[PDB]
Design an enzyme around this catalytic site. Structure first.
Site, short mmCIF file in Angstrom:
data_model
loop_
_atom_site.label_atom_id
_atom_site.label_comp_id
_atom_site.label_asym_id
_atom_site.label_seq_id
_atom_site.Cartn_x
_atom_site.Cartn_y
_atom_site.Cartn_z
N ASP B 329 0.80 -1.52 -0.19
CA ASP B 329 0.05 -0.22 -0.03
C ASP B 329 0.62 1.18 -0.20
O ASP B 329 0.25 2.48 -0.02
CB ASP B 329 -1.21 -0.69 1.15
CG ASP B 329 -2.13 -1.00 1.19
OD1 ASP B 329 -2.41 -0.99 0.08
OD2 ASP B 329 -2.91 -1.69 2.14
N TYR B 414 -10.39 -0.58 1.72
CA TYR B 414 -9.74 -1.20 2.84
C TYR B 414 -9.78 0.70 3.18
O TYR B 414 -9.45 1.38 2.99
CB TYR B 414 -8.52 -1.52 2.77
#
Ligand SMILES: *[C@@H]1O[C@H](CO)[C@@H](O[C@@H]2O[C@H](CO)[C@@H](O)[C@H](O)[C@H]2NC(C)=O)[C@H](O)[C@H]1NC(C)=O
Ligand SMILES: *[C@@H]1O[C@H](CO)[C@@H](O[C@@H]2O[C@H](CO)[C@@H](O)[C@H](O)[C@H]2NC(C)=O)[C@H](O)[C@H]1NC(C)=O
Ligand SMILES: *[C@@H]1O[C@H](CO)[C@@H](O)[C@H](O)[C@H]1NC(C)=O
Ligand SMILES: *[C@@H]1O[C@H](CO)[C@@H](O)[C@H](O)[C@H]1NC(C)=O
Ligand SMILES: [Ca+2]
Ligand SMILES: [Ca+2]
Ligand SMILES: [Ca+2]
Ligand SMILES: [Ca+2]
Ligand SMILES: [Cu+2]
Ligand SMILES: [Cu+2]
Lengths: 704, 699
Positions: B329, B414
């Site tokens: 990420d 998310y």
């Protein structure tokens, strides 16, 4: 079926069982608060929990409720072969019968030495210490300790080395005013033998002063006066932390305070707590401690019972007190030693507080004021949230608020905090904190293999905490199985470039069929997803599950090799799942503390090679940690990081997250007015919806 | 004294005007850039060197130059590179140096470069204009096709199989209005090859429909129209959970609200929080995410720096996109993808809220309103307590209040929650929660080895999350050692009855001298007490220590055998302690996502068999779990039980509990009036007048 079957006995109901037992126990029946060993005695009277068959028959199918009964423990000391006996007494509130269940439960009489040490016993032992034995060494004791009103005594652990012994090591400590005496050990420790039923006949088997063993306090004073003992002057007063609890700093601006803007959102009625989402019953066993029954989320029952079974503290050290010490705290009592919750410190100031009634070592019922507290607590966290700037512009969340029940057991030095907290997701968290004061030794010599110096003359002795919980889940009905889900990687050729390899991630499900398979030792690794489940299934076809998720930093358990280990067999396990029997109500016993070598209940007996494929199951969870004391444990051990327990969490039990339907949820779109009140509840707290209450004037439940 | 403050809006415009005038003309704005252009991808604060910074904050020296770091995409040349350039000094920049070579020993392959927003847009023009109408027959019949306005695309993970690739699998999803599209996979996945610097040259290497592999969309449409492909019609709207976030239930009586009876007990100035006990600075890297510097408990510094380094998500599954997916990420950016906090939901209503400014993929500096929140929270727990009914009648305790700082990064589905909480005992807790939507596949066939059915036609794909933290503890000065304490039982004759045996409990201390000894693999057990310490000692003569206490339910890490694994070798560790160097500022990098096979930073290179006996140390802590999705994750995954992180805890660092000297402490004796105000503070207008609700808005 609208009854309160699980409520601790009221004061009328205790008086009633006392009056009944008085009349029918033969004359010669002494009050327990003044009883000698050879007397007869009602030790305890407390609620006898009902059998499950009948209880659910009532609660679910409307049948009549089962007789509400009590269980009394009776010391029969006045006879040729003195026994302990448990008697059931019912029905309530107007008892008409009594039977002696002792033989029927543990197959035989209860050896008289298994009995707990009474408060009179401790007092007799102190008469022996201060009046007869301790002046035989009054020379030493002037010299070191400012000499018997300034000194004070404290118990240890199992009492002896061998089934049937009743010899306790006792430490001596300065009788500090207004703070913990536990830090100021004076270096003297006496092995007292008080097995005899005549206190005149009680001996002092050994003595220990600052590193050395002696046969008596006389022979210690011989060696002192002969100039042959290097004696250390231990200060008597001092300041800050080691000597106080009162902060020298003056109160500053106030901490944050939590209040309910429009009334509370739950209610307590008797033993029964009720809220928009959760409905449950609650209590304290006298020895077992906390418990909750009949927990129902949005009307459906998840667990029949969740209840502390035992707490353990295994020590090591320089001195004989510390290296013998294994406290099994059920033998003193997590309920007996409950203490008032102080409002605004132990629970939020506006929490609702409830009294607890009990009959132990007396003939009148007493009451502990503010023993429990129930409250709703905003956690600060969102329970759930998503912010979309991608393709579609929206927001949807929900601040986590939580429902809580708390008692605190103060067992001599230790204050255990017991929490049962009820999340809006359908989860149940059990929590266990230890604060208060440390059990300390006098600092001497080869320290460091055995703990840390923590104040002047004070060793913080190394020890483990472990605690046991019974979790009788009834997941979608009584018939449950256990499943072990986990994960694995499998080397594979990439399908669309077989030249290349990829590490392929996969789920792993094994269905545990036998007790032995679901019993997990401390040390052994253990399925990442472990859950009890149903024949039945949710909308998408997965078995309906609740999932145990532990939180432990467990100590090494007391090795099996030890004759003592049987009295707490449960320490050796992380988790065990078991066929739930009436004959197997509990994990420990009040009677294991004073004789763990012939244990009155042995938990390894329950794991005995039966099926757990579609039966009424019960999970047993151990949780605990190691504690090498250190300077920031003075004056009190602090909660932070020392939470231990477990979560019970939905796993394909529902069809979706129940919190989807929350009244407190929040949603808005990009194209809406997020700060207009018809769109967003939060945009009216200000406009009108404020206004903190006037507060109740502070009160406190007092002391003994 | 604001060394660590993210760059202001002026300071960004300043670096951006400087870079414009000096980068050659032909310099395109990044928001519009094609692969073959030149481009400023990022401008953000360049953190100062530690020697110099401390010099200033402790010893009075002048401050180190305030510099920025710009990432530049050099696409317009014979050999295109990426280049990091330092630009200073601020706020009037007069120089610019190319650190690329000096830092990673060579140029930065242009394929390591993050997929720009214009690149995603061009891939979608290719998909919806040129490619998808070749199969408009199948897509009418399965997914209500309209010319691609009802469908929508989502990225995956590493892009390809091999160093240098840039081929991304893309899932297709209904374009659900006002709720997450991530649950409505349509069954179609396209492997797009977009390596070329000319988008016209972009291909579609493979296609996946409903269990089977095809070579193009035309071939799948042949097979459909040949009646040879069993097609199922997937519904398009629906109700509750799987389709909404809005609760149908009307608002009830309100939840509990926390307020400060006589004003706040902390203040936020710029990057600096200040309170009665705690003093620190705070920020977000654009890629690394949260961080705090110069944490000072009652004035003494405990940590130089605590900072998120990386978040990882390894998936598995039926479909190619799921089983190829390993999101690193940082490559997207935890700071970029930070989102406004919604007051009363993400943080207490009465918390103070702070903006964040950034310059990424544009030429103007933008601002994310309410990005941080700082607040004091009463926990409801006591920090400590004793009730004595024994020998002497007294009570002494203290309700735990806590100080907190929170950011939330929304990376596609998310929503990561980042918490830094500051206990009054001297402890620091770092916490990491995951909420938001699950990434989902279309349900087909051999499910179950790979996840749970979680809605109609939706598989919840198994996955692990892990995250990495850098903990630069400076315990009582720079020179630290690490110690490992634990416990043991030793059979021994009972001294006073030697014919009997007793199991004797003993502490166990080992002082870890080498990096290799203090690097702990996932899987192996680890010392119950593990702490960094000093030469110096407390009153009682124990070495002064901070103890790390972890909270992890680790997933099995990606096996070593894998070519990809080096791009996040920190996943294989629970905990590592390390000599702290300036050449080793970080654990991962923005460039690892798009090329993990030739990692731009490889963490296992830091554990290299040096001494850690009396050096300036840094601890690296991995935390994470396994997630087999389940029905109670719809519409969102919930926080409960999913907190992971660690505690930093005093261990003989003070002479006693500092909370003993607390202003909010409470004491009384049996013989006192416990309800009299002179003995007990607890025994004493129209309370909260609340700010009207506002919201930070959207893109
Ligand atoms: C334990 O103690 C009690 C009495 O001290 C025993 O019970 C008595 O037994 C006699 C004859 O067995 C009866 O006539 C008494 O009236 C009984 N009293 C009660 C209230 O139970 C008892 O049997 C002993 N139990 C064992 C097995 O030792
Ligand atoms: C990456 O590309 C840039 C420009 O495309 C290179 O920087 C230039 O280098 C030339 C000489 O090769 C100088 O005369 C220019 O003035 C430079 N511009 C800047 C701003 O640096 C850079 O060399 C390339 N990097 C590497 C390692 O190849
Ligand atoms: C111990 O200290 C308290 C003073 O708080 C006193 O009341 C008590 O009588 C003392 N003596 C003993 C031996 O308990
Ligand atoms: C998707 O739907 C939204 C609103 O529901 C719309 O505004 C948007 O332009 C649509 N199309 C795409 C492919 O983004
Ligand atoms: Ca059994
Ligand atoms: Ca059950
Ligand atoms: Ca190194
Ligand atoms: Ca350091
Ligand atoms: Cu302890
Ligand atoms: Cu997840």
């Amino acid at each position: 079926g609208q009854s309160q079957l699980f409520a601790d006995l009221s004061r009328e109901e205790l008086t009633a069982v006392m009056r009944f037992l008085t009349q029918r126990l033969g004359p010669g029946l002494v009050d327990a608060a003044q009883a000698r060993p050879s007397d007869n005695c009602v030790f305890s009277v407390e609620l006898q929990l009902p059998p499950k068959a009948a209880a659910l028959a009532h609660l679910d199918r409307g049948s009549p409720p089962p007789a509400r009964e009590a269980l009394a423990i009776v010391f029969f000391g006045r006879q040729p072969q003195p026994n302990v006996s448990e008697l059931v007494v019912g029905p309530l509130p107007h008892p008409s019968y009594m039977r002696d269940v002792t033989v029927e439960r543990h197959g035989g009489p209860l050896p008289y030495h298994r009995r707990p040490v009474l408060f009179q016993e401790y007092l007799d032992i102190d008469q022996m210490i201060f009046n007869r034995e301790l002046p035989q060494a009054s020379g030493l004791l002037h010299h070191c300790c400012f000499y018997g009103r300034n000194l004070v005594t404290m118990t240890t652990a199992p009492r002896g080395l061998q089934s049937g012994d009743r010899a306790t090591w006792f430490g001596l400590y300065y009788n500090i005013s207004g703070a913990g005496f536990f830090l100021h050990h004076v270096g003297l420790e006496l092995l007292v033998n008080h097995k005899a039923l005549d206190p005149a006949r009680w001996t002092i088997q050994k003595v220990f002063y600052q590193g050395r063993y002696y046969d008596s306090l006389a022979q210690l004073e011989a060696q002192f006066e002969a100039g042959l003992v290097n004696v250390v002057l231990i200060p008597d007063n001092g300041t800050g932390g080691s000597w106080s609890l009162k902060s020298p700093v003056p109160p500053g601006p106030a901490p944050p305070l939590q209040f309910y803007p429009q009334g509370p959102r739950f209610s307590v009625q008797g033993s029964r707590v009720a809220s928009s989402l959760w409905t449950f019953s609650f209590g304290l066993g006298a020895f077992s401690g906390p418990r909750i029954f009949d927990v129902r989320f949005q009307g459906e029952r998840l667990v029949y019972e969740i209840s502390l079974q035992e707490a353990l503290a295994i020590y090591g050290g320089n001195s004989p007190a510390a290296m013998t010490t294994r406290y099994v705290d059920g033998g003193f009592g997590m309920g007996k030693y409950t203490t008032p919750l102080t409002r605004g410190v132990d629970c939020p100031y506006l929490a609702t507080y409830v009294d607890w009634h009990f009959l132990l070592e007396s003939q009148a019922p007493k009451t502990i004021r503010d023993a429990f507290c129930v409250f709703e607590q905003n956690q600060g966290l969102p329970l759930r949230r998503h912010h979309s700037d991608l393709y579609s512009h929206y927001f949807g969340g929900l601040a986590e608020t939580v429902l809580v029940v708390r008692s605190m057991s103060t067992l001599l030095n230790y204050d255990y905090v017991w929490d049962t907290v009820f999340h809006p997701s359908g989860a149940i968290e059990i929590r266990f904190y230890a604060t208060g004061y440390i059990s300390s030794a006098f600092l001497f010599g080869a320290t460091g293999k055995y703990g840390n110096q923590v104040s002047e003359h004070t060793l913080g002795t190394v020890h483990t905490h472990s605690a046991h919980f019974k979790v009788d889940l009834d997941v979608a009905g009584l018939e449950n199985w256990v499943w072990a889900e986990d994960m694995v990687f499998v080397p594979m050729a990439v399908p669309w470039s077989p030249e290349h390899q990829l590490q392929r991630l996969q789920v792993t499900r094994k269905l545990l069929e036998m007790e032995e398979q679901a019993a997990f030792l401390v040390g052994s690794a253990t399925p990442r997803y472990l859950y009890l489940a149903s024949n039945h299934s949710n909308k998408w076809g997965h078995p309906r599950g609740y999932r145990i998720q532990m939180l432990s930093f467990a100590g090494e358990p007391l090795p099996q090799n030890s004759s003592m280990a049987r009295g707490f067999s449960w320490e050796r396990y992380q988790l065990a799942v078991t066929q739930r029997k009436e004959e197997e109500p509990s994990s420990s016993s009040v009677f294991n503390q004073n004789d763990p070598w012939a244990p009155t209940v042995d938990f390894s007996d329950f794991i005995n090679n039966e099926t757990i494929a579609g039966k009424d199951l019960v999970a047993w969870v151990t949780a605990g940690f190691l504690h090498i004391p250190h300077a920031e444990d003075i004056p009190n051990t602090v909660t932070v990081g020392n939470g231990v327990g477990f979560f019970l969490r939905p796993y394909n039990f529902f069809d979706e997250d129940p919190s989807f339907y929350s009244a407190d949820s929040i949603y808005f779109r990009g194209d809406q007015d997020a700060g207009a009140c018809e769109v967003n509840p939060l945009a009216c707290l200000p406009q009108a919806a404020a206004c903190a209450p006037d507060l109740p004037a502070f009160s406190h439940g007092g002391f003994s």
